[PDB]
Amino acid sequence: MWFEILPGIAVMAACLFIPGMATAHIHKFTNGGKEKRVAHFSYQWNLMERDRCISGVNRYHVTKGLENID
Amino acid sequence: FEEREKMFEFYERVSGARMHAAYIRPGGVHQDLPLGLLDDIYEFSKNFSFRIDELEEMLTNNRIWRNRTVDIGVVTAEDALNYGFSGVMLRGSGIQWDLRKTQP
Amino acid sequence: MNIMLTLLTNVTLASLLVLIAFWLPQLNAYSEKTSPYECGFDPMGSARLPFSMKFFLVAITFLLFDLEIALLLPLPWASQTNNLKTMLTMALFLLILLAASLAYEWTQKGLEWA
Amino acid sequence: GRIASFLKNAWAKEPVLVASFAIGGLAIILPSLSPYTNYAIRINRATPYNYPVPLRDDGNMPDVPSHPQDPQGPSLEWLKNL
Amino acid sequence: TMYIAFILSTIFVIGFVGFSSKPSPIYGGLGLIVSGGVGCGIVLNFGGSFLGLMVFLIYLGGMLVVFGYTTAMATEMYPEVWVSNKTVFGAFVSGLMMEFCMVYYALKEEEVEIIFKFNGLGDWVIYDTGDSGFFSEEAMGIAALYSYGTWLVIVTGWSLLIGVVVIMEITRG
Amino acid sequence: SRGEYVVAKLDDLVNWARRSSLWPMTFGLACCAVEMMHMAAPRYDMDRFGVVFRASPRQSDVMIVAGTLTNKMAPALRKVYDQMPEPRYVVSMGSCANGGGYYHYSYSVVRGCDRIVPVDIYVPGCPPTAEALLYGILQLQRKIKREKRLRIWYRR
Amino acid sequence: MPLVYMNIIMAFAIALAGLLMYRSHLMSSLLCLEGMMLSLFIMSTLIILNTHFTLANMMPIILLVFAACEAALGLSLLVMVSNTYGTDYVQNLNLLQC
Amino acid sequence: VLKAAAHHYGAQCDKPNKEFMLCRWEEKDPRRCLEEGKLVNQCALDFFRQIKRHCAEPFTEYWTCIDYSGLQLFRHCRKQQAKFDECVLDKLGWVRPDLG
Amino acid sequence: MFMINILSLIIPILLAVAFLTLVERKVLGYMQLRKGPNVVGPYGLLQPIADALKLFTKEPLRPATSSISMFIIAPILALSLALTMWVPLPMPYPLINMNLGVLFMLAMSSLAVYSILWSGWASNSKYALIGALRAVAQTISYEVTLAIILLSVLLMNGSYTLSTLITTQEHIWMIFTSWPLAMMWFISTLAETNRAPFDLTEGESELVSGFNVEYAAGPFAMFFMAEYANIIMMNAFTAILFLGASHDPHTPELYTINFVLKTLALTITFLWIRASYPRFRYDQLMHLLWKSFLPLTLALCMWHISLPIMTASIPPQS
Amino acid sequence: SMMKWNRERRRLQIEDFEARIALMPLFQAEKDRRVLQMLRENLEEEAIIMKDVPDWKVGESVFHTTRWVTPMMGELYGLRTNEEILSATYGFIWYT
Amino acid sequence: PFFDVQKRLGLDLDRWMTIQSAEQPHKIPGRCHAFEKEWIECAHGIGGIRAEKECKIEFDDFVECLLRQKTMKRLSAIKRQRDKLIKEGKYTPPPHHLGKEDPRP
Amino acid sequence: ELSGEMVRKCDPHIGLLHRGTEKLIEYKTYLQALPYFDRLDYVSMMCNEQAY
Ligand code: SF4
Phi-psi region of F125 (alpha: psi -120 to 50; beta: other; left: phi over 0): left
Whether G80 contacts E171, CB under 8 Å: yes
CA neighbours closer than 13 Å in the CB half-sphere of residue F127: 31
Rounded CA separation F94/F65 (Å): 8
Whether E30 contacts I114, CB under 8 Å: yes
Q: Work out how many domains chain G is built from and give that number.
A: 1
What is the C-alpha R_g of chain H? 15
Ligand 1, pocket-test mutation among F37, F95, F104, F123, most atoms within 8 A of CB? F95
Q: For I47, list phi and psi in degrees, rounded to 5.
A: -60, -45
- Put simply, the answer to whether C37 touches F82 (Cβ < 8 Å) is no
Whether G41 contacts E44, CB under 8 Å: no
DSSP per-residue string spanning I77-107: HHHHHHHHTTTT--BSB-SS--TTHHHHHHH
Which C residues, 55 through 114, put their C-beta within 8 Å of a C-beta on chain I? 55, 58-59, 62, 65-66, 69, 72-73, 75-77, 79-80, 84, 88, 91-92, 95, 98-99, 102, 106, 111, 113
Residue count of chain L:
52
Q: Work out how many domains chain C is built from and give that number.
A: 1
Neighbors of chain A with 3 or more C-beta pairs under 8 Å: E, H, I, J, K
The CATH code of the domain that includes E77 is 1.20.120.1200
Q: Where are the beta strands (DSSP E) in chain D?
A: none
The nearest CA of chain J is from the CA of K73 a distance in Å of 10
Which residue type, as a one-letter code, is found at position I147? A
L6's enclosing H/E stretch is strand L6-7
Q: Between D15-29 and I294-311, two packed helices, what is the crossing angle to 10 degrees?
A: 30
The reply to whether F149 sits in an annotated binding site is: no
Residues facing F64 on adjacent strands? F91
Rounded CA separation J42/J46 (Å): 6
Ligand 1, pocket-test mutation among F68, F73, F113, F122, most atoms within 8 A of CB? F68
The CATH code of the domain that includes C52 is 1.20.58.1610
CB contacts of L49 in chain B (<8 Å) are 21-25
Q: Does L25 lie at the interface with B, CB-CB under 8 angstroms?
A: no
CA I260–ligand 1 middle distance (angstroms): 51
Which H, E and C letters describe chain F, residue by residue? CHHHHHHHHHHHHHHHHHHHCCCEECCECCHHHHHHHHHCCCCCCHHHHCCCCECCHHHCCEEEEECCCECCCHHHHHHHHHCCCCCCEEEEEHHHHHHCHHHCCCCCECCCHHHCCCCCEEECCCCCCHHHHHHHHHHHHHHHHCCCHHHHHCCC
Give the residue, by CA position, lying nearest to ligand 1 atom 2.
Answer: F126
Whether C10 contacts I76, CB under 8 Å: no
Whether F32 contacts F70, CB under 8 Å: no
Which G residues, 2 through 41, put their C-beta within 8 Å of a C-beta on chain E? 2-11, 14-15, 17-18, 21-28, 30-32, 34-35, 38-39, 41
Residues facing I251 on adjacent strands? I248
Rounded CA separation C78/C89 (Å): 12
Which residue type, as a one-letter code, is found at position D70? D
Rounded CA separation I274/I268 (Å): 10
What is the C-alpha R_g of chain E? 20
Q: For residue C114, tell me if it sits in a domain.
A: no
Q: Which has the closest alpha carbon to I135: I217, I208, I195?
A: I195
- Put simply, the answer to whether D30 touches I310 (Cβ < 8 Å) is yes
Whether G34 contacts E22, CB under 8 Å: no
Beta-carbon contacts of H89 under 8 Å, excluding residues fewer than 6 positions away, are H95
Q: Both ends of chain H: CA-CA distance in Å?
A: 22
Domain membership of residue C73 as a residue range: 1-108
Q: Both ends of chain D: CA-CA distance in Å?
A: 45
Residues facing B29 on adjacent strands? B24
Residues facing F89 on adjacent strands? F62
Q: For residue G97, tell me if it sits in a domain.
A: no
Helix (H, G, I), strand (E, B) or coil at G85: helix
Give the residue, by CA position, lying nearest to ligand 1 atom 5.
Answer: F67
Buried b (16+ CB within 10 A) or exposed e, I198-217: bbbbbbeebbbbbbbbbbbb
Q: CA of H69: how far to CAs of A32, A36, C2, G12, in Å?
A: 12, 8, 22, 47
The nearest CA of chain C is from the CA of D78 a distance in Å of 18
Q: Does F75 lie at the interface with L, CB-CB under 8 angstroms?
A: no
Q: Which has the closest alpha carbon to C102: I297, I61, F50?
A: I297
When scoring K20, K21, K33 by the number of chain G Cβ atoms within 10 A, the one with the most, hence best to mutate, is K20
Q: For residue G68, tell me if it sits in a domain.
A: yes
Locate all alpha helices (DSSP H) within chain K, ordered by sequence: 5-9, 33-42, 48-53, 56-67, 69-88
D3's enclosing H/E stretch is helix D2-13
Ligand 1, pocket-test mutation among F27, F35, F96, most atoms within 8 A of CB? F96
* Discontinuities in chain H (C→N > 2.5 Å), after residue: none
Whether I312 contacts D37, CB under 8 Å: yes
Q: Between E49-70 and E25-45, two packed helices, what is the crossing angle to 10 degrees?
A: 180
- Put simply, the answer to whether K76 touches E128 (Cβ < 8 Å) is no
What is the C-alpha R_g of chain C? 25
Helix (H, G, I), strand (E, B) or coil at E135: coil
What is the C-alpha R_g of chain A? 20
Which H, E and C letters describe B46-91, residue by residue? HHHHHHHHHHHHHHCCCHHHHHHHCCCCCCCHHHHHHCCCCCHHHH
Rounded CA separation E57/I185 (Å): 19
Whether B19 contacts L42, CB under 8 Å: yes
Whether F35 contacts F134, CB under 8 Å: no
Whether I74 contacts I215, CB under 8 Å: no
Q: For residue C96, tell me if it sits in a domain.
A: yes
- β pairing state of E117-119 and E111-113: antiparallel
CB contacts of E147 in chain C (<8 Å) are 78, 81-83, 86-87, 90
Quickly count: other Cβ atoms within 10 Å of residue A8's Cβ.
25
Whether A62 contacts A55, CB under 8 Å: yes
When scoring H14, H19, H20 by the number of chain J Cβ atoms within 10 A, the one with the most, hence best to mutate, is H20
Quickly count: other Cβ atoms within 10 Å of residue L39's Cβ.
23
Whether F109 contacts L19, CB under 8 Å: yes
What is the Cα G33 distance to its own chain's centre? 2
What is the C-alpha R_g of chain I? 20
Rounded CA separation I184/L10 (Å): 37
- Put simply, the answer to whether G72 touches C70 (Cβ < 8 Å) is no
Q: Is I234 exposed, middle or buried (0-12, 13-18, 19+ CB in 10 A)?
A: buried
Domain membership of residue G59 as a residue range: 3-92
CA neighbours closer than 13 Å in the CB half-sphere of residue G16: 8
Closest partner residue to G61 (CB to CB) among C60, C66, C71 is: C71
Q: For residue C103, tell me if it sits in a domain.
A: yes
In the DSSP assignment, the letter for residue K27 is G
- Put simply, the answer to whether C51 touches L4 (Cβ < 8 Å) is yes
Which I residues, 223 through 282, put their C-beta within 8 Å of a C-beta on chain C? none
- Put simply, the answer to whether K17 touches E149 (Cβ < 8 Å) is yes
In the DSSP assignment, the letter for residue E156 is H
- Put simply, the answer to whether H26 touches D56 (Cβ < 8 Å) is yes
Q: For E146, list phi and psi in degrees, rounded to 5.
A: -85, -15
CA F31–ligand 1 middle distance (angstroms): 5
What is the C-alpha R_g of chain D? 25
The reply to whether F96 sits in an annotated binding site is: yes
Whether B33 contacts B11, CB under 8 Å: no
Quickly count: other Cβ atoms within 10 Å of residue I285's Cβ.
22
The CATH code of the domain that includes G24 is 1.10.287.3510
What is the C-alpha R_g of chain G? 17
Rounded CA separation J93/G20 (Å): 38
Whether I158 contacts I315, CB under 8 Å: yes
Rounded CA separation F47/F39 (Å): 9
Q: Which has the closest alpha carbon to A22: I10, C9, I88?
A: I10
Number of Cβ pairs < 8 A linking chain E and chain J: 41
Rounded CA separation E14/I78 (Å): 23
CA F95–ligand 1 middle distance (angstroms): 6
Residues with CB under 6 A from ligand 1: F 30-32, 67-68, 94-96, 101-102, 126-127; L 39, 42
Domain membership of residue E27 as a residue range: 4-172
Q: Which has the closest alpha carbon to I33: F41, D74, B10, H48?
A: F41
Whether A53 contacts K104, CB under 8 Å: yes
| Dihedral sign of CA atoms H8, H10, H11, H15 in order | positive
Q: For residue C34, tell me if it sits in a domain.
A: yes
Rounded CA separation E146/F25 (Å): 58
Q: Does J51 lie at the interface with K, CB-CB under 8 angstroms?
A: no
Q: For residue C10, tell me if it sits in a domain.
A: yes
Q: Do chains E and J touch (3 or more CB pairs under 8 A)?
A: yes
CA F68–ligand 1 middle distance (angstroms): 7
Q: Between F130-145 and F31-39, two packed helices, what is the crossing angle to 10 degrees?
A: 70
DSSP per-residue string spanning chain H: -TTTTHHHHHHHSHHHHHHHHHHHHHH--GGGSHHHHHHHHHHHHHHHHHHHHHSHHHHHHHHHHHHHSTT--STT-HHHHHHHHHHIIIII--------
Rounded CA separation J14/J4 (Å): 16
Q: Is A31 exposed, middle or buried (0-12, 13-18, 19+ CB in 10 A)?
A: middle
J33's enclosing H/E stretch is helix J2-49
The reply to whether F113 sits in an annotated binding site is: no
Q: For residue C113, tell me if it sits in a domain.
A: no
Rounded CA separation E17/I112 (Å): 24
Quickly count: other Cβ atoms within 10 Å of residue A2's Cβ.
9
Q: For I93, list phi and psi in degrees, rounded to 5.
A: -100, 130
Which J residues, 35 through 74, put their C-beta within 8 Å of a C-beta on chain C? none
Q: Work out how many domains chain E is built from and give that number.
A: 1
Q: For residue G98, tell me if it sits in a domain.
A: no
Q: Where are the beta strands (DSSP E) in chain E?
A: 111-113, 117-119
Which residue type, as a one-letter code, is found at position D40? A
